[PDB]
Design a protein around this ligand. Structure first.
Ligand code: NAG
Ligand code: NAG
Lengths: 49, 50
């Protein structure tokens, strides 16, 4: 924590290194979830399945 | 019920300048190095206060 009347950590636009407002307050890091897309590599139906 | 309180010598008013006084914290939200625009009431950057 840094100062009492303001504790919600956030640095650029969306990181928001806090949660909302706990009684113990204080801020550690951010890891809600982070995963991306998928693609399929094929050689050709008439070549293989 | 009247009280007689007269002043024989009155000190003339003076002008007091101020640079960066009068900018409060309307919201309790912390801002870890972010630039935000405010729309509230503040004292001017350069002025004379009574
Ligand atoms: C309960 O509140 C106190 C604050 O006095 C602090 O220990 C913490 O924020 C809360 N949780 C526990 C387990 O004490
Ligand atoms: C697939 O390959 C075979 C032999 O190379 C060819 O005869 C055929 O026209 C190709 N295409 C399809 C849709 O089978």
């Amino acid at each position: 924590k840094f100062l009492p009347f303001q504790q919600f950590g956030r640095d650029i636009a969306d990181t928001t290194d806090a949660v909302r407002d706990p009684q113990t307050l204080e801020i550690l890091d951010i890891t809600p979830c982070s995963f991306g897309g998928v693609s399929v590599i094929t050689p050709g139906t008439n070549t293989s399945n | 019920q009247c009280v007689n309180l007269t002043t024989r010598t009155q000190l003339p008013p003076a002008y007091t300048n101020s640079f960066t006084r009068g900018v409060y914290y309307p919201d309790k939200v912390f801002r870890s190095s972010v630039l935000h625009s405010t729309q509230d009431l503040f004292l001017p950057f350069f002025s004379n206060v009574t």
